[PDB]
């Protein structure tokens, strides 16, 4: 287990992960190639460089005491290992909705600025990737403090999980379920980026003199980096700075033990007291788990970045890339109409599962995408031109009945085309989830690919319904609603 062999592997790994994209048709092979190199490095290393003797629950009392000494709320809840979500907070008393039950002063947080003033400071001021990417800076901040026995944040670090359910921890066959989906490319990117980052910083630590005082200089395993970046991506937060002029990334102890449920964001930052504050999202009776609303993220973002799949996600969505073709003879006019509306000529839009299926920006694009030349002129010339552009994102004011029929006909055909690019059908995915016994990580992948097709299927039906509604208004010569 010579260090020179590991240096040769990280050098091979860095160059492999620094190569350009091999084309979307060879991304799976590249992924497997990178996996093989990573697993060979991981098999030659000793896992996490720092492990703690006690189990996770043994260190929660020290977290409460540590957080109490620095002004945080520690009464009214307890840590419980729930089966569905893992460890979380459970109310020991009745908590009414909108009650301020949880607050964490800034002194407890781990932030980019706390990383600047730590042992990582010297290396931070020289490496561009650390300066430009605060999430990576927080990840190394967490690693350096983890390997420091007398760190101020040890009570928080000793309570963190030792493993996560991000795709970085998935088996090869669990990721294979995602083949031919939209989400698997982000899984590829996450894995390639993490592998490139580890090898890059492994060599940076070994060559920069201002990293010699780091504990990572003596031990920095791939397991360390995967755990660190998984800790940050599943728990990081955006808070304002002390003066309130700039925003920064932060890890918020104690409060980040809350699991996710549907609702509204009830967590903010109070600058007057300089502390994170969280009011109860709903009534929490004693003995009930305390939840918060993480945000309006899709199940793909929850799986890839948060490490879980949320059933009945009201904000689920899929991507759909659309653009005006340069072969279109009306390209110049369409591009100008889109530019005056603040919409690019080509972009990635979203199809939502909750009505409406498309946003105002996507509706405005599809209207211009299907405009005739004479309709485009009325959006470019005259005293009413800007007024017409102002209503492009409004469903109540169409350009014309024919324009609506054409844009909903296109969306139905495109959504039907996207469904035909998946390896399996919706009925096949449901059969797998029903007849096979799967792991949590495998279920996440299969539910993820199922959710994509179900959003596309609902977009197909909603577009067909809208097509028939506006065709009725056109066959009956309905008066066009004016604003």
């Amino acid at each position: 287990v010579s260090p020179k062999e590991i240096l040769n592997l990280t050098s091979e790994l860095l160059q492999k992960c620094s190569s350009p994209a091999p084309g979307p048709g060879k991304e799976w092979e590249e992924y497997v190639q990178i996996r093989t190199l990573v697993e060979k490095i991981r098999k030659k290393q000793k896992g996490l460089s720092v492990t703690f003797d006690g189990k996770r629950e043994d260190y929660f009392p020290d977290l409460m005491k540590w957080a109490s000494e620095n002004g945080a709320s520690v009464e009214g809840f307890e840590m419980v290992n729930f089966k569905e979500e893992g460890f979380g907070l459970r109310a020991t008393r009745d908590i009414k909705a909108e009650e301020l039950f949880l607050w964490v002063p800034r002194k407890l947080l781990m932030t980019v600025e706390s990383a600047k003033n730590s042992v990582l400071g010297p290396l931070y001021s020289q490496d561009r990737i650390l300066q430009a990417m605060g999430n990576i800076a927080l990840a190394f901040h967490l690693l350096c403090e983890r390997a420091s026995p007398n760190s101020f944040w040890q009570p928080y670090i000793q309570t963190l999980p030792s493993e996560y359910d991000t795709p970085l921890y998935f088996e090869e066959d669990e990721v294979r379920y995602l083949q031919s989906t939209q989400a698997i490319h982000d899984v590829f990117s996450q894995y390639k980026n993490t592998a490139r980052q580890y090898a890059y910083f492994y060599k940076v630590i070994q060559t920069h003199p201002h990293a010699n005082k780091l504990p990572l200089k003596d031990s920095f395993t791939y397991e360390d980096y995967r755990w660190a970046v998984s800790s940050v991506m599943t728990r990081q937060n955006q808070i304002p700075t002390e003066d309130g002029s700039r925003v920064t990334l932060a890890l918020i102890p104690l409060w980040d033990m809350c699991n996710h449920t549907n609702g509204l964001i009830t967590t903010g930052y109070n600058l007057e007291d300089d502390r994170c504050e969280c009011v109860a999202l709903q009534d929490f009776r004693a003995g009930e788990q305390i939840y918060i609303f993480y945000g309006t993220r899709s199940n793909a973002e929850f799986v890839i970045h948060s490490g879980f799949f949320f059933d009945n996600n009201s904000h689920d969505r899929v991507k759909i890339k659309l653009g005006v073709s340069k072969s279109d003879r009306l390209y110049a006019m369409k591009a100008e109409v889109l530019a005056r509306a603040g919409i690019p000529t080509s972009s990635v839009f979203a199809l939502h599962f909750t009505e409406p299926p498309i946003s105002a920006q996507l509706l405005a694009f599809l209207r211009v995408f299907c405009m005739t030349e004479e309709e485009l002129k009325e959006h470019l010339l005259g005293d009413s031109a800007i007024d017409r552009i102002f209503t492009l994102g409004n469903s109540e004011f169409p350009v014309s009945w024919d324009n609506e029929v054409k844009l909903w006909t296109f969306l139905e055909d495109r959504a039907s085309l996207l469904l035909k690019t998946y390896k399996t059908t919706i009925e096949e995915d449901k059969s797998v989830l029903k007849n096979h016994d799967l792991s949590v990580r495998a279920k996440m992948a299969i539910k993820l690919r199922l959710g994509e097709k179900e959003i596309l299927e609902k977009a197909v039906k909603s577009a067909a319904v809208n097509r028939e509604y506006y065709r009725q208004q056109m066959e009956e010569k309905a008066p066009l609603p004016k604003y």
């Binding site: 999430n135 990117s189 599943t234 990081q236 304002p240 990334l249 994170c276 993220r297 970045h305």
Partner: peptide, 15 residues
């Protein structure tokens, strides 16, 4: 309202 709403686990760019 919340002057600084905190989205937990906000997605950041790793590229």
């Amino acid at each position: 309202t919340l002057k600084y709403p905190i989205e937990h686990g906000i997605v950041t760019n790793w590229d």
